[PDB]
């Protein structure tokens, strides 16, 4: 049973899928393979709340109905660097111009 | 295998290659030569397309791969009016 | 006459038109001369038992926008042999529209056609907006496909 | 341009005929379907050349509203005409022929139920 995720840190954004069942740890293993940083240097969030390596994505609240391919759920990323416990920072996306009158 | 797509405003988007190849425009940017002694690319720079759009373009790639050849009922791909015009532009450019 | 028409079989067929799409669906019967006739629309989620005949040819569209839809993961439906009463099932779904055609739908839905050319977009996309989904255009395509598939 | 029937009478006619149109058999199938609307002369010329007084349920429903029928038996006559017409064109044993027969039943049983209750 799959969930669709945007994993986001600063001006990085990773588009991937995982099982509802699969664990926050196992997700960090996918992130290792992409960015090259071990799980013990990561820290994943759902919003501002930090996640637990043991818990399933399903338990953290990532579900079929709230992490759909066309509307993926956002996983926050922060990188430890020895004692550098960096803060969660997500550089927002650009804004669209105001809706032309002909579309109102 | 993952590729990196980069928006006009410098945002990085790390997606699966197969997903990105959905775009003919990208398919032709990746399949040609480059990288000293390599016959395919792993990094693309967009000059026109901003982050809020290219995000959506990836969301689509995800959707397209998931729901092509699926006997599961398909959900509607949503577009907010505000983003519509730019996204149309982008798609037209990207051939997808 | 044409390559896409219903056969006047006269052999009944019980069908379930099931609208699994979020669109209000227009069933379109292709008559014995291959012309499309519209039939009562199915609201989203709704399904209906309907009486048709062996060899009779159907497609399904958004009643409002004439956007194309799928039926058993293909464009045309013809009911097979009923076997022992039990009905044949027509599962109407959305297709995976190209992002472009998807965007087109959305813009067309928000803008009056008299204003397409007042949007800040490439001149080519004015035409693309104006080229509305049409069954007649499609039938040509589907024919010239079967015709090209009869080499 | 026609004197209205008593409101109750028209209501009876509708109940009876809806009872028919709506009736489905054991298997889930609505029998009235094929008979609701005649084919066009272009569509099926054979029918119009052979059947003297064609009629469909659409017409009957319209004749009730328009008050052509003045009694339940005027209505019955026209349903029996339908089913007879069916029976004259489709020939015995056919899924259509027998449906017309069930619908004759359904109709009389509906009449007795609404026009004596
Ligand atoms: C409700 C709904 N919602 C979504 S679609 C839908 C809906 C779907 C289907 C239909 C309706 C239910 N279905 C259709 O329209 C189907 C769908 C499409 O495949 C074409 N089609 C036909 O029915 C076409 N019939 C034939 O080709 C063969 N016909 C030979 C003549 N035959 C006879 C009739 C009468 C007789 C009739 C009235 C009164 C006294 C009569 O004696 N008697 N004898 C006959 N042999 C009837 C069958 C037709 C050319 C158009 C006629 C109606 C609604």
mmCIF file of N, CA, C and O and ligand atoms in Angstrom, chain C residues 6-8 10 17 27 29 32 39-42 48-53 56-58, chain D residues 33-40 43-44 47 55-57 82 85-87 89-90 96, ligand 1:
data_model
loop_
_atom_site.group_PDB
_atom_site.id
_atom_site.type_symbol
_atom_site.label_atom_id
_atom_site.label_comp_id
_atom_site.label_asym_id
_atom_site.label_seq_id
_atom_site.Cartn_x
_atom_site.Cartn_y
_atom_site.Cartn_z
ATOM 1 N N UNK C 6 -21.994 0.377 -35.775
ATOM 2 C CA UNK C 6 -22.677 -0.743 -35.131
ATOM 3 C C UNK C 6 -23.157 -1.680 -36.211
ATOM 4 O O UNK C 6 -23.463 -1.248 -37.317
ATOM 5 N N UNK C 7 -23.194 -2.941 -35.886
ATOM 6 C CA UNK C 7 -23.768 -4.033 -36.708
ATOM 7 C C UNK C 7 -25.223 -4.175 -36.297
ATOM 8 O O UNK C 7 -25.493 -4.117 -35.083
ATOM 9 N N UNK C 8 -26.108 -4.264 -37.272
ATOM 10 C CA UNK C 8 -27.552 -4.431 -36.973
ATOM 11 C C UNK C 8 -27.829 -5.907 -36.693
ATOM 12 O O UNK C 8 -28.501 -6.602 -37.498
ATOM 13 N N UNK C 10 -29.443 -7.362 -34.054
ATOM 14 C CA UNK C 10 -30.786 -7.598 -33.504
ATOM 15 C C UNK C 10 -30.728 -8.575 -32.346
ATOM 16 O O UNK C 10 -31.817 -9.001 -31.919
ATOM 17 N N UNK C 17 -23.219 0.162 -17.654
ATOM 18 C CA UNK C 17 -22.430 1.401 -17.762
ATOM 19 C C UNK C 17 -22.119 1.863 -16.352
ATOM 20 O O UNK C 17 -22.997 2.245 -15.611
ATOM 21 N N UNK C 27 -22.717 8.820 -22.744
ATOM 22 C CA UNK C 27 -22.570 7.665 -23.603
ATOM 23 C C UNK C 27 -22.919 8.097 -25.024
ATOM 24 O O UNK C 27 -23.863 8.812 -25.214
ATOM 25 N N UNK C 29 -23.534 6.338 -28.777
ATOM 26 C CA UNK C 29 -23.752 5.153 -29.616
ATOM 27 C C UNK C 29 -23.370 5.539 -31.016
ATOM 28 O O UNK C 29 -23.818 6.603 -31.462
ATOM 29 N N UNK C 32 -25.849 2.740 -37.382
ATOM 30 C CA UNK C 32 -25.528 1.780 -38.457
ATOM 31 C C UNK C 32 -24.814 2.490 -39.588
ATOM 32 O O UNK C 32 -24.233 1.779 -40.372
ATOM 33 N N UNK C 39 -26.851 9.723 -25.661
ATOM 34 C CA UNK C 39 -27.760 8.963 -24.782
ATOM 35 C C UNK C 39 -27.714 9.582 -23.379
ATOM 36 O O UNK C 39 -26.834 10.406 -23.134
ATOM 37 N N UNK C 40 -28.689 9.279 -22.492
ATOM 38 C CA UNK C 40 -28.767 9.921 -21.183
ATOM 39 C C UNK C 40 -27.459 9.870 -20.397
ATOM 40 O O UNK C 40 -26.786 8.877 -20.436
ATOM 41 N N UNK C 41 -27.122 10.962 -19.727
ATOM 42 C CA UNK C 41 -25.806 11.098 -19.039
ATOM 43 C C UNK C 41 -25.831 10.408 -17.671
ATOM 44 O O UNK C 41 -26.891 10.512 -16.960
ATOM 45 N N UNK C 42 -24.697 9.826 -17.296
ATOM 46 C CA UNK C 42 -24.472 9.141 -16.006
ATOM 47 C C UNK C 42 -23.693 10.120 -15.125
ATOM 48 O O UNK C 42 -22.663 10.651 -15.516
ATOM 49 N N UNK C 48 -25.518 1.958 -14.224
ATOM 50 C CA UNK C 48 -26.873 1.614 -14.773
ATOM 51 C C UNK C 48 -26.843 0.352 -15.649
ATOM 52 O O UNK C 48 -25.820 0.129 -16.406
ATOM 53 N N UNK C 49 -27.838 -0.520 -15.487
ATOM 54 C CA UNK C 49 -28.112 -1.617 -16.434
ATOM 55 C C UNK C 49 -28.788 -0.980 -17.625
ATOM 56 O O UNK C 49 -29.641 -0.128 -17.401
ATOM 57 N N UNK C 50 -28.297 -1.282 -18.822
ATOM 58 C CA UNK C 50 -28.837 -0.744 -20.087
ATOM 59 C C UNK C 50 -28.939 -1.827 -21.149
ATOM 60 O O UNK C 50 -28.024 -2.708 -21.214
ATOM 61 N N UNK C 51 -29.965 -1.732 -21.994
ATOM 62 C CA UNK C 51 -30.220 -2.728 -23.058
ATOM 63 C C UNK C 51 -29.556 -2.269 -24.335
ATOM 64 O O UNK C 51 -29.928 -1.165 -24.807
ATOM 65 N N UNK C 52 -28.618 -3.070 -24.860
ATOM 66 C CA UNK C 52 -27.994 -2.824 -26.172
ATOM 67 C C UNK C 52 -27.984 -4.118 -26.971
ATOM 68 O O UNK C 52 -28.676 -5.057 -26.559
ATOM 69 N N UNK C 53 -27.259 -4.153 -28.065
ATOM 70 C CA UNK C 53 -27.280 -5.338 -28.941
ATOM 71 C C UNK C 53 -25.873 -5.767 -29.250
ATOM 72 O O UNK C 53 -24.966 -4.942 -29.148
ATOM 73 N N UNK C 56 -22.857 -3.723 -31.433
ATOM 74 C CA UNK C 56 -23.115 -2.277 -31.292
ATOM 75 C C UNK C 56 -21.943 -1.564 -30.634
ATOM 76 O O UNK C 56 -21.512 -2.025 -29.617
ATOM 77 N N UNK C 57 -21.616 -0.398 -31.136
ATOM 78 C CA UNK C 57 -20.348 0.300 -30.837
ATOM 79 C C UNK C 57 -20.610 1.596 -30.070
ATOM 80 O O UNK C 57 -21.415 2.412 -30.475
ATOM 81 N N UNK C 58 -19.885 1.738 -28.963
ATOM 82 C CA UNK C 58 -20.026 2.805 -27.967
ATOM 83 C C UNK C 58 -18.696 3.517 -27.691
ATOM 84 O O UNK C 58 -17.686 2.894 -27.833
ATOM 85 N N UNK D 33 -37.800 -1.576 -21.019
ATOM 86 C CA UNK D 33 -36.693 -0.904 -21.740
ATOM 87 C C UNK D 33 -36.892 -0.812 -23.254
ATOM 88 O O UNK D 33 -36.988 0.348 -23.810
ATOM 89 N N UNK D 34 -36.900 -1.963 -23.918
ATOM 90 C CA UNK D 34 -36.895 -2.070 -25.401
ATOM 91 C C UNK D 34 -38.112 -1.389 -26.037
ATOM 92 O O UNK D 34 -38.002 -0.929 -27.183
ATOM 93 N N UNK D 35 -39.203 -1.295 -25.271
ATOM 94 C CA UNK D 35 -40.497 -0.788 -25.707
ATOM 95 C C UNK D 35 -40.731 0.670 -25.358
ATOM 96 O O UNK D 35 -41.721 1.186 -25.830
ATOM 97 N N UNK D 36 -39.866 1.286 -24.556
ATOM 98 C CA UNK D 36 -40.080 2.673 -24.092
ATOM 99 C C UNK D 36 -40.258 3.590 -25.320
ATOM 100 O O UNK D 36 -41.225 4.451 -25.324
ATOM 101 N N UNK D 37 -39.344 3.463 -26.270
ATOM 102 C CA UNK D 37 -39.324 4.285 -27.489
ATOM 103 C C UNK D 37 -39.124 3.401 -28.708
ATOM 104 O O UNK D 37 -38.143 2.607 -28.782
ATOM 105 N N UNK D 38 -40.032 3.573 -29.662
ATOM 106 C CA UNK D 38 -40.004 2.899 -30.968
ATOM 107 C C UNK D 38 -38.685 3.227 -31.661
ATOM 108 O O UNK D 38 -38.047 4.205 -31.323
ATOM 109 N N UNK D 39 -38.224 2.396 -32.599
ATOM 110 C CA UNK D 39 -37.172 2.807 -33.539
ATOM 111 C C UNK D 39 -37.749 3.801 -34.541
ATOM 112 O O UNK D 39 -38.926 3.809 -34.715
ATOM 113 N N UNK D 40 -36.872 4.575 -35.169
ATOM 114 C CA UNK D 40 -37.229 5.510 -36.264
ATOM 115 C C UNK D 40 -37.526 4.725 -37.513
ATOM 116 O O UNK D 40 -37.069 3.582 -37.632
ATOM 117 N N UNK D 43 -34.269 3.919 -39.172
ATOM 118 C CA UNK D 43 -33.703 2.816 -38.389
ATOM 119 C C UNK D 43 -34.349 1.469 -38.727
ATOM 120 O O UNK D 43 -33.599 0.476 -38.877
ATOM 121 N N UNK D 44 -35.660 1.349 -38.643
ATOM 122 C CA UNK D 44 -36.316 0.052 -38.849
ATOM 123 C C UNK D 44 -37.586 0.231 -39.652
ATOM 124 O O UNK D 44 -38.676 0.231 -39.086
ATOM 125 N N UNK D 47 -40.850 -2.517 -39.507
ATOM 126 C CA UNK D 47 -41.823 -2.419 -38.406
ATOM 127 C C UNK D 47 -43.022 -1.614 -38.860
ATOM 128 O O UNK D 47 -44.138 -2.111 -38.731
ATOM 129 N N UNK D 55 -47.097 2.135 -31.557
ATOM 130 C CA UNK D 55 -47.154 2.874 -30.260
ATOM 131 C C UNK D 55 -46.019 2.411 -29.355
ATOM 132 O O UNK D 55 -45.647 1.190 -29.439
ATOM 133 N N UNK D 56 -45.510 3.335 -28.543
ATOM 134 C CA UNK D 56 -44.446 3.083 -27.533
ATOM 135 C C UNK D 56 -44.903 3.636 -26.200
ATOM 136 O O UNK D 56 -45.900 4.415 -26.198
ATOM 137 N N UNK D 57 -44.166 3.378 -25.121
ATOM 138 C CA UNK D 57 -44.604 3.831 -23.758
ATOM 139 C C UNK D 57 -44.495 5.354 -23.697
ATOM 140 O O UNK D 57 -45.386 6.040 -23.201
ATOM 141 N N UNK D 82 -49.770 -2.069 -27.885
ATOM 142 C CA UNK D 82 -48.276 -2.181 -27.830
ATOM 143 C C UNK D 82 -47.842 -3.655 -27.842
ATOM 144 O O UNK D 82 -47.171 -4.120 -28.807
ATOM 145 N N UNK D 85 -48.642 -5.540 -30.822
ATOM 146 C CA UNK D 85 -47.750 -5.077 -31.899
ATOM 147 C C UNK D 85 -46.406 -5.804 -31.817
ATOM 148 O O UNK D 85 -45.897 -6.305 -32.830
ATOM 149 N N UNK D 86 -45.846 -5.861 -30.621
ATOM 150 C CA UNK D 86 -44.629 -6.597 -30.288
ATOM 151 C C UNK D 86 -44.752 -8.071 -30.706
ATOM 152 O O UNK D 86 -43.836 -8.639 -31.368
ATOM 153 N N UNK D 87 -45.884 -8.662 -30.350
ATOM 154 C CA UNK D 87 -46.163 -10.101 -30.525
ATOM 155 C C UNK D 87 -46.347 -10.415 -32.012
ATOM 156 O O UNK D 87 -46.037 -11.516 -32.390
ATOM 157 N N UNK D 89 -44.685 -8.761 -34.556
ATOM 158 C CA UNK D 89 -43.428 -8.447 -35.269
ATOM 159 C C UNK D 89 -42.299 -9.387 -34.845
ATOM 160 O O UNK D 89 -41.429 -9.676 -35.676
ATOM 161 N N UNK D 90 -42.325 -9.805 -33.581
ATOM 162 C CA UNK D 90 -41.202 -10.507 -32.931
ATOM 163 C C UNK D 90 -41.374 -12.019 -32.931
ATOM 164 O O UNK D 90 -40.316 -12.712 -32.889
ATOM 165 N N UNK D 96 -38.172 -10.946 -26.522
ATOM 166 C CA UNK D 96 -39.035 -9.730 -26.599
ATOM 167 C C UNK D 96 -40.506 -10.165 -26.468
ATOM 168 O O UNK D 96 -41.272 -9.608 -25.570
HETATM 169 C C1 LIG E 1 -30.904 5.235 -19.461
HETATM 170 C C2 LIG E 1 -29.521 5.349 -20.018
HETATM 171 N N1 LIG E 1 -28.544 5.882 -19.327
HETATM 172 C C3 LIG E 1 -27.392 5.913 -19.908
HETATM 173 S S1 LIG E 1 -27.467 5.228 -21.483
HETATM 174 C C4 LIG E 1 -29.176 4.935 -21.246
HETATM 175 C C5 LIG E 1 -30.001 4.264 -22.234
HETATM 176 C C6 LIG E 1 -29.385 3.245 -22.951
HETATM 177 C C7 LIG E 1 -30.061 2.523 -23.902
HETATM 178 C C8 LIG E 1 -31.376 2.816 -24.157
HETATM 179 C C9 LIG E 1 -32.150 2.040 -25.183
HETATM 180 C C10 LIG E 1 -33.009 1.034 -24.437
HETATM 181 N N2 LIG E 1 -31.248 1.268 -25.995
HETATM 182 C C11 LIG E 1 -31.010 1.552 -27.260
HETATM 183 O O1 LIG E 1 -31.515 2.469 -27.841
HETATM 184 C C12 LIG E 1 -30.041 0.655 -27.938
HETATM 185 C C13 LIG E 1 -28.638 1.183 -27.625
HETATM 186 C C14 LIG E 1 -27.867 1.079 -28.970
HETATM 187 O O2 LIG E 1 -27.130 -0.141 -29.064
HETATM 188 C C15 LIG E 1 -28.994 1.129 -30.039
HETATM 189 N N3 LIG E 1 -30.221 0.651 -29.381
HETATM 190 C C16 LIG E 1 -31.345 0.235 -29.945
HETATM 191 O O3 LIG E 1 -32.238 -0.132 -29.207
HETATM 192 C C17 LIG E 1 -31.503 0.193 -31.432
HETATM 193 N N4 LIG E 1 -32.170 -1.070 -31.680
HETATM 194 C C18 LIG E 1 -31.747 -1.956 -32.593
HETATM 195 O O4 LIG E 1 -30.765 -1.745 -33.273
HETATM 196 C C19 LIG E 1 -32.507 -3.243 -32.764
HETATM 197 N N5 LIG E 1 -33.930 -3.006 -32.522
HETATM 198 C C20 LIG E 1 -34.747 -3.730 -33.483
HETATM 199 C C21 LIG E 1 -36.203 -3.323 -33.252
HETATM 200 N N6 LIG E 1 -36.537 -3.756 -31.914
HETATM 201 C C22 LIG E 1 -37.906 -3.844 -31.698
HETATM 202 C C23 LIG E 1 -38.664 -2.845 -31.095
HETATM 203 C C24 LIG E 1 -40.046 -3.060 -30.954
HETATM 204 C C25 LIG E 1 -40.921 -2.070 -30.274
HETATM 205 C C26 LIG E 1 -40.386 -0.922 -29.685
HETATM 206 C C27 LIG E 1 -41.201 -0.038 -29.008
HETATM 207 C C28 LIG E 1 -42.558 -0.287 -28.886
HETATM 208 C C29 LIG E 1 -43.108 -1.424 -29.450
HETATM 209 C C30 LIG E 1 -42.299 -2.319 -30.130
HETATM 210 O O5 LIG E 1 -42.880 -3.417 -30.663
HETATM 211 N N7 LIG E 1 -40.559 -4.221 -31.367
HETATM 212 N N8 LIG E 1 -39.862 -5.144 -31.926
HETATM 213 C C31 LIG E 1 -38.560 -5.004 -32.111
HETATM 214 N N9 LIG E 1 -37.803 -5.994 -32.715
HETATM 215 C C32 LIG E 1 -35.756 -2.995 -30.954
HETATM 216 C C33 LIG E 1 -34.315 -3.417 -31.181
HETATM 217 C C34 LIG E 1 -32.380 1.307 -31.986
HETATM 218 C C35 LIG E 1 -32.081 1.360 -33.483
HETATM 219 C C36 LIG E 1 -32.054 2.652 -31.324
HETATM 220 C C37 LIG E 1 -33.879 1.026 -31.826
HETATM 221 C C38 LIG E 1 -31.996 3.831 -23.435
HETATM 222 C C39 LIG E 1 -31.324 4.564 -22.472
#
